[PDB]
Amino acid sequence: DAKTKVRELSADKVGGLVRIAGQIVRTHPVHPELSRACFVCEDCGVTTRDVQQQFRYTQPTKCANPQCMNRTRFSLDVNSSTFVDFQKIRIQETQAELPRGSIPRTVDVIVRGEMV
């Protein structure tokens, strides 16, 4: 029940649970996205599992074999990795929000999984 207006999205409110309303302008198509990955060490053939991805594609910082010195030479394994359905959307301010003499603001929205 805690609605907030689009212009009230300050940098204070990063990370909290929020409700908002808007009008949808664009709906981009669907892509698979990498979530947790498995990498094979090219030197020794050991699989390192569950490398959690950030916004960027990342390799492990260290081989899982304790008697191995590799930190660079890795190859991704596809049939062990996990993929996530992804969608990107743009929204606009509804007309009832607008202040005096003002043009509507727009936001980028990220959607995952079954809501695609």
Give the residues lining the site for another protein (CB under 8 A).
27, 29-34, 53, 55-57, 76, 78-79, 83-86, 88, 110, 116
Of 2, 4, 3, 5, nearest to 99 by C-alpha is 5
What gap in Å lies between CA 105 and CA 7, rounded to an integer? 8
**Out of Zn ion, another protein, none, which partner does residue 44 contact, by CB within 5 to 8 A per kind?**
Zn ion
Q: Give how many residues touch Zn ion by CB under 5 A.
A: 7
Q: Which residues contact 62 (CB under 8 A, 6 or more apart)?
A: 71
**Residue 15 or 29: which CB sits closer to another protein?**
29
How many alpha carbons fall within 13 Å on the CB side of residue 109?
20
Report the DSSP beta bridge partners of residue 7.
Answer: none
**Residue 85 or 97: which CB sits closer to another protein?**
85
Q: Which residues contact 45 (CB under 8 A, 6 or more apart)?
A: none
Quick note: the x/- pattern for Zn ion over 50-79, rule CB under 5 A, is -------------x-x--x-x---------
Per CB under 5 A, does 38 bind Zn ion?
A: no
What gap in Å lies between CA 73 and CA 76, rounded to an integer? 10
**Out of Zn ion, another protein, none, which partner does residue 29 contact, by CB within 5 to 8 A per kind?**
another protein
* Residues in contact with Zn ion by the rule CB under 5 A: 41, 43-44, 63, 65, 68, 70
